[PDB]
């Protein structure tokens, strides 16, 4: 049995360096670590990501964007995430369904219930064991074209979701000195290892 950990938050929050940090802590304890990201994580998922990010003169329907995001997820689950967990590996996934509630839900305004329906439809009972929210104040692809209010509603959705399920989430103040943040990651580790074992 393995463990499914997701990381959510914007760039410049240190997600990658901190994911590397966590990954080294686990690896030095003999635990296999599978790094991955969404949307993407397999050849086909990465091609779907390309459609998602590529600007176009044709407006992408909201449902189209939502269904593509979940198509990439479906493929990623089958190709990478589930097999990793089956190996007893710890998956460190940069962005997952919380990013859907945040971007397609908070950002775009899609009803949370439609996102919930697809989450269950695609994932069955699988949810992350732990979700690390890297929180900090707020050419381009389709999403980077968006405005400050979009990214503000994005930020707030992570915190709202994190607040409703405090046991599954750990919110990190990415505005804190890196050293302090990684100290937080160290304090999370025992519980992580306990979960895994």
Ligand X SMILES: Cc1cn([C@H]2C[C@H](N=[N+]=[N-])[C@@H](COP(=O)(O)O)O2)c(=O)[nH]c1=O
| Known binding-site positions for ATP | 9-16
User: Which of its own copies, ligand X, Cl ion, none interacts with 118 (beta carbon under 5 to 8 A by kind)?
Assistant: its own copies
Q: Is 95 in the site for ligand X (CB under 6 A)?
A: yes
The stretch among 18-26, 31-39, 129-137, 181-189 that binds ligand X (CB under 6 A) is: 31-39
The number of angstroms, rounded, from the C-alpha of 194 to the middle of its chain's C-alpha atoms is 22
How is residue 23 written in tokens?
A: 């990954």
Confirm if 154 and 105 have CB atoms less than 8 A apart: no
Interacting residue with ligand X among 6, 19, 75, 103 (CB under 6 A): 103
Nearer to its own copies, 31 or 69 (CB): 69
Count of positions on this chain that bind ligand X (CB under 6 A): 12
Nearer to its own copies, 83 or 184 (CB): 83
Q: According to the 3-state scheme, what is the secondary structure of 90-156? A: EEEEECCHHHHHHHHHHHCCCCHHHHHHHHHHHHCCCCCCEEEEEECCCCCCCCCCCCHHHHHHHHH
Please report how close the Cβ of residue 28 comes to ligand X at its closest, in angstroms: 27
């Amino acid at each position: 049995t393995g463990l499914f950990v997701t990381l959510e938050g914007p760039e410049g929050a240190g997600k990658s360096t901190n994911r590397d940090y966590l990954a080294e802590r686990l690896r030095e304890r003999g635990i296999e670590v599978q790094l991955t990201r969404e949307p993407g994580g397999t050849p086909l998922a990465e091609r779907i990501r390309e459609l998602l990010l590529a600007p176009s003169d044709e407006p992408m329907a909201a449902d189209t964007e939502l269904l593509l995001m979940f198509a990439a997820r479906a493929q990623h689950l089958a190709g990478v995430i589930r097999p990793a967990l089956a190996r007893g590996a710890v998956v460190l996934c940069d962005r997952f369904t919380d990013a859907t509630y945040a971007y397609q839900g908070g950002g775009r305004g899609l009803p949370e219930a439609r996102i919930a329906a697809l989450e269950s439809f695609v994932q069955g009972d699988l949810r992350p064991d732990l979700t690390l929210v890297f929180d900090l104040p707020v050419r381009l692809d389709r999403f980077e074209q968006e405005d400050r209010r979009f990214f503000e509603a994005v930020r707030q959705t992570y915190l709202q979701r994190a607040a409703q399920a405090p046991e599954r989430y750990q919110v990190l103040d990415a505005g804190l000195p890196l050293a302090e943040v990684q100290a937080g990651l160290d304090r999370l580790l025992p519980n992580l290892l306990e979960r895994l074992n």
